[PDB]
Design a protein around this ligand. Structure first.
Ligand SMILES: N#Cc1cc(Cl)cc(Oc2c(Cl)ccc(CNC(=O)c3[nH]cnc3Cl)c2F)c1
Ligand SMILES: [Mg+2]
Lengths: 560, 404
């Protein structure tokens, strides 16, 4: 049948302190026993396996199946137990190539390696551990015993050892053909040159022949696939790429399963179709669920879906990468914590697009989110292209400047430029650096009982006002925010607020514009309406005037 | 040379740490360097039967690229070897010297072969762009730079090398930490620099070649917590002061606020001025004295990890504290003068260097920055050959204001 590479083997070991597998072979039907004898006989003839005596004490179960439509039998070895006992290997690949990272070539050839694993030899000292037995008709006589000489299907080490073997084999050819790109992925090679067809089709043959010298067979000119290449949910054309066609089902009743599969397809489409959204559709999935259970679409979900269909109605494509030019990345706010981006080198021919829609924490603002989005895109660009892009952001240099200099975390956007693409990113309020003269000073406080969960929130002011609301099923944290909320509700357009909650101060000093907490959102609403707010902290239970009084006031009935 | 056998701490396997993505520039720089190290026999290509990995980076330190391997994991997992079995004792005298010069002696390690059974644990990967190729895998055949085992092993050879120099200059302190020699004298700076050049010549005969040239550790003194001084004091100002004083009392014993709080009594407007009574005036003055002196009761414990916290103060200013127990500050300081990340990495390096000099240990940093931002950018400005442990925190709010 097929060659087995003369490449050197990779030495392989069991996990220290472990012996090979000794799993009992279950009796099989005559039908199955016969199929396996014919298969293994053929495999032995081809070099793939070899007969061994009963001296070897190792065993792994063997099975055989044949679909009800078919007449071809297949052998199945269950390497579960050997796989436990086989050393860890180096992971195959950190990631997979993104089409957007491919440099365009005049000619591209795909070469799949035939019977990849069976074409590579296995460490002779390790073969013994791959032993299996075709049992006798009713397990009366000793079975027929074999071991693998090549990399078995389903064994832990085959992917890594194959790739390793392919790398060593390719090396010399690379060193003599530096202009030719050869991508390694699973059994495949993707080979690209800028040569004219004639000199390319020649170089493919020199490679195919070089590969054959090392026992690896590949398809010839007639059997080699043609563009567009359909690969991993992508279409790769000669001067553009896109995602394989997306079928958005129509349904009366949407099941969890149907929505999961829809979100997945939309997420997949988002890498080249700009503006895709999944927020509202994702909201439907955050629950008890159950695959077959129908979930009715909310109005927002229906509108989101409708907008995506519009986006998807006409085909969109991306271009390939030109490493002589810079990368430009643009980001737009889509609202409700959704961001969308596009990366091009020539406006506006996108290499790719994407989205960012991640809550980091409970309370945040658009400036923080934008920075996070920039960071994600930057990492992505280093992975795909090996360099960071220049950014175009919908935030004034002045807004960014004010924010970063005053904020307590280190933060740094690399080279960027402002672009007037509304909505623009702004901070919606700022806290005063100093006390407001002629403004009422509210001393606020909250308290919660741990057993009962009852709470009181309230304030006393320097103008003699007071108030105290009672709260049920609450916490200390919540009462402290309520207290601040009260003071904002009952105050004029200017106000000084004094709290002993580091928790509340910390939230509010970061100028959040959105929160998971309803209370925090209400506090934000107020802070925007105010003309000036100065917020200060004092330590609790030190009898500081103003604080001691509202403390007595809110402790009554709740704590000593 | 006979190789020193190295065994991992029982129950621990070697490092399986993933390579952070690298820019093309750095990948290309690493490929040159590694190609050359291969020819020289320092490293060899490995196969997939090695499941280990340690990240690698490229830095400038100069305009020449340098390979920096992140052995933080291998270091944790090999701690018994380099700290207990073959520990390098740290001299208390180093910090007392007027001048300390830091010399890179990392090349020394490349002439000493590494135990063959340990080599596999020094595996690393040069990645490629867009996962084009599988990426180039190597291990070390010689003592690698960045691994704490290397100086532990080379210790006996370094002693021979330095013996004449030490004998001839018995008041000079020389300390090895990782890839560097720290050399301290009390000499006039010209004389100091001359003895350093002299030392270079000794090293040269064994084939070896945020901070000024020298360090001046005897001119390191504390950052007192400082209380403002004013003519007029508002309610707000006293509140601020009491908050500052309050927290300060957890560190310093004897800090008192009774009198100051007495002024604030009632529900007073923040802007309203409050003349200080004489008792308060004096209470304030007493605290002020306490803060200028060191903390009684706080001592370095060699069995414990050091911790460093850093605060961004604005205008290119950063404060820091080093401790083992919270509030038991062993050292506090300030760093000043780019962008935030650049400044932070400068501060981290300076603080670590002082930490090596004072205790012979790097601290674990609590860094006020987003993990990914840090991870993307830190290598752009990093120039040390070691890397400290770090984690990521949220600083706020008044821990900031309580310093500077
Ligand atoms: N199938 C497949 C496949 C997958 C990948 Cl990741 C790459 C691949 O080959 C390409 C290579 Cl090696 C370089 C560039 C590209 C992008 N396409 C072209 O340059 C091109 N030129 C003419 N026809 C086409 Cl298509 C590859 F597809 C082919
Ligand atoms: Mg309280």
């Amino acid at each position: 049948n097929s060659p087995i590479s003369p490449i050197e083997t990779v030495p392989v070991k069991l996990k220290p302190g472990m012996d090979g597998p000794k799993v009992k072979q279950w009796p099989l039907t005559e039908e199955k026993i016969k199929a396996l004898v014919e298969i293994c006989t053929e495999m032995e003839k081809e070099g793939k396996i070899s007969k061994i005596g009963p001296e070897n004490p190792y065993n792994t179960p063997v099975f055989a199946i044949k679909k009800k439509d078919s007449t071809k039998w297949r052998k199945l070895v269950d390497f579960r137990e050997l796989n436990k006992r086989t050393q860890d290997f180096w992971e195959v690949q950190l990631g997979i190539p993104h089409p957007a990272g491919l440099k365009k070539k005049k000619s591209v050839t795909v070469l799949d390696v035939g019977d990849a694993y069976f074409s590579v030899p296995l460490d002779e000292d390790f073969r013994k551990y791959t032993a299996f037995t075709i049992p006798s008709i009713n397990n009366e006589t000793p079975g027929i015993r074999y071991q693998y000489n090549v990399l078995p299907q389903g064994w832990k080490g085959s992917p890594a050892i194959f790739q390793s073997s392919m790398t060593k084999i390719l090396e010399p050819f690379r060193k003599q053909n530096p202009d030719i790109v050869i991508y390694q992925y699973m059994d495949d090679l993707y080979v690209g040159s800028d040569l004219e067809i004639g000199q390319h089709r020649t170089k493919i043959e020199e490679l195919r022949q070089h590969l054959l010298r090392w026992g690896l067979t590949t398809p010839d000119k007639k059997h080699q696939k043609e563009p567009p290449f359909l690969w991993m949910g992508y279409e790769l054309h000669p001067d553009k790429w896109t995602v394989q066609p997306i079928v958005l089902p129509e349904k009366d009743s949407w099941t969890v399963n149907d929505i999961q599969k829809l979100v997945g397809k939309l997420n997949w489409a988002s890498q080249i179709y700009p503006g895709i959204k999944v927020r509202q559709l994702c909201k439907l999935l955050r629950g008890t669920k159950a695959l077959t259970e129908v979930i009715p679409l909310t109005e927002e979900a229906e509108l989101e879906l409708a907008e995506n269909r519009e986006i998807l109605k006409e085909p969109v494509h991306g271009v390939y990468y030109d490493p002589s030019k810079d990368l430009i990345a643009e980001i737009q706010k889509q609202g409700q914590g959704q961001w969308t981006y596009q990366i091009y080198q020539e406006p506006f021919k996108n290499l790719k697009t994407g989205k960012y829609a991640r809550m980091r924490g409970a309370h945040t603002n658009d400036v923080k989110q934008l920075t996070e989005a920039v960071q994600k895109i930057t990492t992505e660009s280093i992975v795909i292209w090996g360099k960071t892009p220049k950014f175009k952001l919908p935030i004034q240099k002045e807004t960014w400047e004010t924010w970063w200099t005053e904020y307590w975390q280190a933060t740094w956007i690399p080279e960027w430029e402002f672009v007037n693409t509304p909505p623009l990113v702004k901070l919606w309020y700022q806290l005063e650096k100093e006390p407001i003269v002629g403004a009422e000073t509210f001393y606020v406080d909250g308290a919660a009982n741990r057993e009962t969960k009852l709470g009181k929130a309230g304030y006393v002011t320097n103008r003699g006002r007071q108030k105290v609301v009672t709260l049920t099923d609450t916490t200390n944290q919540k009462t402290e925010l309520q207290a601040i909320y009260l003071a904002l509700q009952d105050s004029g357009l200017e106000v000084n607020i004094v709290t002993d909650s580091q928790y509340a101060l910390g939230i509010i000093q970061a100028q959040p514009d959105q929160s998971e907490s309803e209370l925090v959102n209400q506090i934000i609403e107020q802070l925007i309406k105010k003309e000036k707010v100065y917020l200060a902290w004092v330590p609790a239970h030190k009898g500081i005037g103003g604080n001691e009084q509202v403390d007595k006031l809110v402790s009554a009935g709740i704590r000593k | 040379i006979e190789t020193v056998p190295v065994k991992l701490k029982p129950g621990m396997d070697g490092p399986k740490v993933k390579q952070w993505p690298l820019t093309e520039e750095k990948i290309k720089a690493l490929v040159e360097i590694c190609t050359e190290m291969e020819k020289e026999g320092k490293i060899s290509k490995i196969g997939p039967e090695n499941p280990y990995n340690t990240p690698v980076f490229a830095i400038k330190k100069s305009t020449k690229w340098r390979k920096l391997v992140d052995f933080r994991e291998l270091n944790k997992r090999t701690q018994d070897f380099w700290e207990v079995q073959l520990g390098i004792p740290h001299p208390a005298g180093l910090k007392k010297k007027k001048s300390v010069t830091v010399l890179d002696v990392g090349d020394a390690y490349f002439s000493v072969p590494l135990d063959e059974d340990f080599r596999k644990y020094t595996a690393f990967t040069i990645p490629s762009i867009n996962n084009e190729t599988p990426g180039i895998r190597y291990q070390y055949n010689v003592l690698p730079q960045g691994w704490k085992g290397s100086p532990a092993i080379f210790q006996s050879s370094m002693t021979k090398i330095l013996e004449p120099f030490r004998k001839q200059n018995p008041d000079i302190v020389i300390y090895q930490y990782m890839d560097d020699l720290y050399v301290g004298s009390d000499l006039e700076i010209g004389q100091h620099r001359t003895k350093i050049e002299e030392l270079r010549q000794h090293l040269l005969r064994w084939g070896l070649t945020w901070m000024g040239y020298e360090l001046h550790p005897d001119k390191w003194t504390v950052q007192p917590i400082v209380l403002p001084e004013k003519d007029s004091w508002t309610v707000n100002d006293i509140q601020k002061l009491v908050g500052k004083l309050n927290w300060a009392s957890q560190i310093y014993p004897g800090i008192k606020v009774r009198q100051l709080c007495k002024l604030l009594r009632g529900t007073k407007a923040l802007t309203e001025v409050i003349p200080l009574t004489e008792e308060a005036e004096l209470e304030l003055a007493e605290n002020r004295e306490i803060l200028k002196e060191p903390v009684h009761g706080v001592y370095y414990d060699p069995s414990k990890d050091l911790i460093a916290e850093i605060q961004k103060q604005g205008q290119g200013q950063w404060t820091y504290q080093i401790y083992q127990e919270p509030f038991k500050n062993l050292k506090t300081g300030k760093y000043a003068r780019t962008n935030d990340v650049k400044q932070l990495t400068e501060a981290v390096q300076k603080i670590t260097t002082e930490s090596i000099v004072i205790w012979g240990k790097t601290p674990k940093f609590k860094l006020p920055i987003q993990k990914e931002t840090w991870e993307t950018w830190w290598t752009e400005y990093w120039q040390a050959t070691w890397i400290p442990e770090w984690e990521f925190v949220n600083t706020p709010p008044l821990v900031k204001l309580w310093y500077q």
